[PDB]
Design a protein around this ligand. Sequence first.
Ligand SMILES: CCCCCCCCCCCCOS(=O)(=O)O
Ligand SMILES: CCCCCCCCCCCCOS(=O)(=O)O
Ligand SMILES: CCCCCCCCCCCCOS(=O)(=O)O
Ligand SMILES: CCCCCCCCCCCCOS(=O)(=O)O
Lengths: 70, 70, 70, 70, 70, 70, 70, 70
Amino acid sequence: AVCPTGLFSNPLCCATNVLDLIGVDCKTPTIAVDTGAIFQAHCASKGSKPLCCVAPVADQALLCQKAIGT
Amino acid sequence: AVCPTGLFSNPLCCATNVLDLIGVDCKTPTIAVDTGAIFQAHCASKGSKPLCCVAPVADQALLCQKAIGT
Amino acid sequence: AVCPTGLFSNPLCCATNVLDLIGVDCKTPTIAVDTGAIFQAHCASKGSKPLCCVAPVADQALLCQKAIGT
Amino acid sequence: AVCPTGLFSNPLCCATNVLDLIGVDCKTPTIAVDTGAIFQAHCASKGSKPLCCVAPVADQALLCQKAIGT
Amino acid sequence: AVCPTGLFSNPLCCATNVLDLIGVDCKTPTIAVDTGAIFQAHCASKGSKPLCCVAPVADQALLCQKAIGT
Amino acid sequence: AVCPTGLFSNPLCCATNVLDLIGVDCKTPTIAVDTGAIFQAHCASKGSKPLCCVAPVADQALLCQKAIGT
Amino acid sequence: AVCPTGLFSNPLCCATNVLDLIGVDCKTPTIAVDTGAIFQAHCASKGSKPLCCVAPVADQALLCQKAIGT
Amino acid sequence: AVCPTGLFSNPLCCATNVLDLIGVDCKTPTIAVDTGAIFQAHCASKGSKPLCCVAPVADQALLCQKAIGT
Ligand SMILES: CCCCCCCCCCCCOS(=O)(=O)O
Ligand SMILES: CCCCCCCCCCCCOS(=O)(=O)O
Ligand SMILES: CCCCCCCCCCCCOS(=O)(=O)O
Ligand SMILES: CCCCCCCCCCCCOS(=O)(=O)O
């Protein structure tokens, strides 16, 4: 789990987190993201940041929080 | 130049370009970028996008134009 | 042409046009849209409105104007 | 009911739900919607989405929750 | 006329004009307003301001210009 | 008390309540507002609505909720 | 003239200029501001920046541009 | 401490606090601020306000709480 279960449970690669609450330009991982390094690097390659969001869907601003450690 | 002159004449690396207008999460280039390949190459080294923005200052959101050549 | 050439030249089906300038939740037609009726009905079926936008890309808010007649 | 009770207890048809929070371009239901199939059926007849919102008023954006059953 | 012609050529009563640009909480005039005294007189009968806006539709925020004569 | 004690405790006359949370164009009562009618009418005369806000200060958007009954 | 005549002609001391277009928390000079230094220092004392705005009125966000030199 | 602990536990100097929530145009303190008089004294030396914010990072707007003691 790179994201907690529950609310912010859906890991997405997003350009930025506005106000640390709004994940903007989010698109879902293309590989399997089972650790924080995997998640992070997979996003920093896409020119995205690793976020955990309230829905698994991609493009459309939505609530997110950053992945821990990162 | 990798930016026009006149209004949008400052290269900055930004996370995204909201509405294609507003540059968010930008940084001043740290190297000298004089081609479009080098610009987005220096920005990708940040997960950033090459933009052309109304000012040299990177703190506080800005009016930005997507870089040409990228 | 359901959209003018030039700036607002890219026909998209979008949930709404904020301030008559910002097309929100936009996704591109799935069929061929060669008249205003075709364009319109194709969008009203997707629960979208027909807009003409400054880019052919889908999800990400962007500048748009409504299609004429509609 | 097709909405909870408490806070988000008003069915309204809206174009979209910005951030999953803000209902935009909403209308008061014109028919009586007492199942979730009927609700989004009455909304789709507008290109709208069934939402559950903090008030009965449809003019001015609102805090809204996606309908359950839709 | 109590509005110009061209762009801002629709009188509407609105609660305020955000940034002097965005008309918020507007209503269609219910009476015929053909002087500037009568316009803000018909709007004040709502706690509203007389504005001149880009469209006749009052649902959804709008680009508006403060009325002249008021 | 036209406003609850605590958070939304400061009665202001405001042009509108954005998203039912943000009181915009707020200016403080010029008379004494000791009942809901007094509060309300005093605002509807100023072309404002009666709101209860998180601070007694006037011009600057701030969190508010509508006065009860009104 | 610390501000041009015409559009951005009204000198105000404002907390910040959002997107270099929106003067936020603006209040008018308390002394006479006849040069750029006078204007600037008078604002930097109020914890404001010197801006030139489209109206002489204080509190309410409005279009502004920074004073030259500063 | 000049900030609480828990959520809003980072002192930053910011131009304003939009809605009393969003800290805009902030900077990291450059000196050590351990009283409330010293904090707004170090911020006023910038035309800034002492705020207590959810993170140590000052680039990109933030959730902030007005400083207590100021
Ligand atoms: C209006 C549509 C924008 C896309 C068209 C191409 C750029 C136009 C630049 C406008 C002038 C400002 O540009 S600048 O060259 O002065 O920096
Ligand atoms: C906080 C996460 C939101 C998704 C969880 C499910 C809805 C929670 C409703 C919160 C209370 C308000 O709802 S209501 O039942 O009172 O109308
Ligand atoms: C740009 C500054 C605005 C204030 C100046 C006076 C109004 C200018 C109207 C611009 C054209 C649109 O107006 S309209 O007459 O076509 O409706
Ligand atoms: C909700 C109203 C806000 C004003 C009341 C006083 C501050 C409340 C802090 C909420 C918890 C977060 O604060 S913190 O101590 O954890 O940083």
